A and B are shown apart, each in its own frame.
Chain A
Amino acid sequence: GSQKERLLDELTLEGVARYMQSERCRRVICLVGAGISTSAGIPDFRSPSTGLYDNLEKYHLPYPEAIFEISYFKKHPEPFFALAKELYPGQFKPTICHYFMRLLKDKGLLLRCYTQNIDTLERIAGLEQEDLVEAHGTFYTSHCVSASCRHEYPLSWMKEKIFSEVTPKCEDCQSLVKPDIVFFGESLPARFFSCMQSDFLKVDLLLVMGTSLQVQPFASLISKAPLSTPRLLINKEKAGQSDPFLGMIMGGGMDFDSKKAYRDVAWLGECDQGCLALAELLGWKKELEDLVRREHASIDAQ
């Protein structure tokens, strides 16, 4: 129930792997963020140097955060579209970490991937809509913002607009056409809430990859798991701990290291390497290598 039992034989990658191949581990939820797509050429926000916050000087905006806030987008969409042009990859190639999740799906272990990313790489790796909660939406589709229109446009249309440097307008009514992303200030999709209500009732492992767990309400997903569900973080830095200050005012933060630690494991490094290591323990390494090479070769030949 709400008891804090220890189901990992040890708080290591090796322990997680053994658990994953026990009968108790049938339903895995992945929570992922921008860290899983940095090796695919898309910057995160927070990384020193290569993160976007460091690299937004030219846009002459108040504080680097505004270009992804809904009120600033409403005032002027042009900076956002300009940056989208700058960031739009020539080629969409999912990472090892993406294909690791594809392996979970093919093995019948994936209950859901909840992603904060908007880059569509989960879809390209072969996660289906069913499998996915795009908690912050997606560039995959776009919609005219006009309540009485709401015409849908595909990414090839939006891409053309973004590269032509033409602010996207609706062909039916000439209102702005906006990528289906959730800007800061916006409500998350209803899907997010209903999947969360059901999925966290019966999850056996939470795998958390490439996110700082600072964006809410996404971050609070870690507290929705049962207290005995193991949680593995694969990330360059620890994340999701309780802050010693905020934590003094009235969910289960990550606890990898304290005296009371019983189910949380942190593997610090590149997501691609951590997933590769985990795959190796599970005996999936060659499968993973073959999938990535074949999928990448297939993309390379488009």
Chain B
Amino acid sequence: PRKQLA
């Protein structure tokens, strides 16, 4: 998966 906020 991809760098991301929740």
Contacts and interface: CB of A to CB of B under 8 A. Distances in A.
For B1, B3, B5, which residue has the most chain A Cβ atoms within 10 angstroms? B3
Please classify how large the interface on chain B is, using the bins under 10, 10 to 19, 20 to 34, 35 or more: under 10
Contact of B2 (A65, A185, A219): A185
B4 A219 contact: no
B1 A65 contact: no
Nearest to A188: B3
A214 B5 contact: yes
A28 interface: no
A136 B3 contact: yes
A184 B6 contact: no
Contacts of B5: 65, 184, 214-216
Interface string A205-219: 000000000111111
Contacts of A5: none
Interface string A174-209: 000000001111111000000000000000000000
Contact of B6 (A182, A183, A188, A219): A219
A50 B4 CA distance: 22
A217 B5 CA distance: 9
Interface of B: 1-6
